[PDB]
Amino acid sequence: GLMQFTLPVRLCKEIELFHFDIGPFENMWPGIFVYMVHRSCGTSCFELEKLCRFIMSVKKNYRRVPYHNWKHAVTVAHCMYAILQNNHTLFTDLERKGLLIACLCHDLDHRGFSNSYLQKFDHPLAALYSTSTMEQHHFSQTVSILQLEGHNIFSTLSSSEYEQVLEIIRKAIIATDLALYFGNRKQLEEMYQTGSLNLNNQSHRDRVIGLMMTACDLCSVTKLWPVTKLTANDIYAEFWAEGDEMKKLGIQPIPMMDRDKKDEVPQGQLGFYNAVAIPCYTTLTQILPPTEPLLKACRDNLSQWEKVIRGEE
Ligand SMILES: Cn1ncc(C(=O)NCc2ccccn2)c1C(=O)Nc1ccn2cc(-c3ccccc3)nc2n1
Ligand SMILES: [Mg+2]
Ligand SMILES: [Zn+2]
């Protein structure tokens, strides 16, 4: 009840900033996550015995892949923490509870391969889930862990508040399927410009929460340049491995995943910042003004990639 988590002074201050890096000490990430839940929700939102046991079960069910790992899980939840703390009054008690958990669980049991590779492989999960394959799997694993004896962190909610929170978490996690982001932001784009955006419309919140989820999930591009630069190795190690596997099936992968075309990475990063990241954080800044630092940090990094191309690094 009266047992706060407290971080050292530098973390205490820096964690409140969008660009905060959780650091290389694995053992502090669970305490960082609890620290965030407590400030974002209350010391009452979850029984600490159960929360702690849910966190360690989620950790166990992430794999040791270069990028889609436990570190990513907590990185994505912190960005969401930054968005919720900078938009105090816009979100319900339920939404603050459900979205930090959604972020922590959003890539549960990822294998470091795209939906596409599952499909070209004919992986069972592709038969069981035709679209958003890994994302439906990740929601399924979240529910599995919630149902372990001692792991139901929501058990204190009324029957309908529990259905409302599982429904938020499900939509939240499906939304991290980037194939659904493009149409989600086009609609949010039109809805904000024509002036029909209405946050009391549940189908409109859904869309907004979906874009928040895309923004947290991509937040590697919103760090200080050295974090972004070294992180990018990790995502390319999954991409190239998938390219290797595509080649093993007898399929030339897309260049993104062809390790023979490492050279064209800075150009490929440019396309991505322009086609995905900038549009994402632009539309997010328009709908939620206090998220502006993510857009600015993203633009700084776009600019840092242009510098790489020009030979200046
Ligand atoms: C999905 N998803 N999720 C996150 C990211 C990402 O790259 N995020 C950026 C970050 C992630 C982790 C750490 C640092 N920076 C992406 C993505 O599709 N990126 C991309 C997108 C398109 N491409 C094209 C190439 C390319 C590379 C070499 C030669 C030719 C082309 N390269 C591409 N890369
Ligand atoms: Mg994912
Ligand atoms: Zn993710």
| Residue 228 Cα: closest atom of ligand 1 | 14
Question: What b/e readout covers 88-121, taking b as 16+ CB neighbours within 10 angstroms?
Answer: eeebeebbbbbbbbbbbbbbbbbebbbbbbbebe
Q: Are 191 and 197 in contact (CB under 8 A)?
A: yes
Could you tell me if the CB of 226 is within 6 A of ligand 1?
A: no
In this structure, the number of other CB atoms found within 10 A of the CB of residue 2 comes to 4
In angstroms, what is the resolution? 2.4
- Taking the C-alpha atoms of residue 138 and residue 143, their distance in angstroms, rounded to an integer, is 9
Q: How far is the CA of 254 from the centre of ligand 2 (A)?
A: 19
- Taking the C-alpha atoms of residue 236 and residue 255, their distance in angstroms, rounded to an integer, is 11
| Ligand closest in space to the Cα of 80 | 3
- Taking the C-alpha atoms of residue 311 and residue 313, their distance in angstroms, rounded to an integer, is 5
Q: Are 176 and 106 in contact (CB under 8 A)?
A: yes
Protein residues near ligand 2, an ion, with CB under 5 A: 107, 176
Method by which this entry was solved: X-ray
Q: Are 70 and 59 in contact (CB under 8 A)?
A: yes
Q: To which H or E segment does residue 31 belong?
A: helix 29-40
Write out the two tokens for 129.
């889930």
Q: Are 126 and 133 in contact (CB under 8 A)?
A: yes
Please give the DSSP secondary-structure letter assigned to residue 275.
I
Structural domains of the chain in order of their starting residue, each with its CATH number: 28-310 (1.10.1300.10)
72 among annotated binding-site residues: yes
Please give the DSSP secondary-structure letter assigned to residue 200.
T
Q: Let me know the angle formed at the C-alpha of 138 by 200 and 276, rounded to the nearest 5 degrees.
A: 65
Q: Are 4 and 210 in contact (CB under 8 A)?
A: no
- Taking the C-alpha atoms of residue 97 and residue 165, their distance in angstroms, rounded to an integer, is 8
Q: How far is the CA of 110 from the centre of ligand 3 (A)?
A: 9
- Taking the C-alpha atoms of residue 225 and residue 93, their distance in angstroms, rounded to an integer, is 34
Which residues, other chains included, contact 84 with Cβ-Cβ below 8 Å and sequence gap of 6+? 40, 91, 96, 99, 100
Write out the two tokens for 5.
């988590």
| Residue 235 Cα: closest atom of ligand 1 | 12
Could you tell me if the CB of 228 is within 6 A of ligand 1?
A: yes
- Taking the C-alpha atoms of residue 160 and residue 178, their distance in angstroms, rounded to an integer, is 30
Termini Cα distance of the chain = 52
Write out the two tokens for 102.
């959604």
Residues with catalytic roles: 68
3-class SS of residue 291: helix
Percentages helix, strand, coil for the chain (3-state, rounded to 5) are: 70, 0, 30
- Taking the C-alpha atoms of residue 298 and residue 93, their distance in angstroms, rounded to an integer, is 30
Q: Are 103 and 142 in contact (CB under 8 A)?
A: no
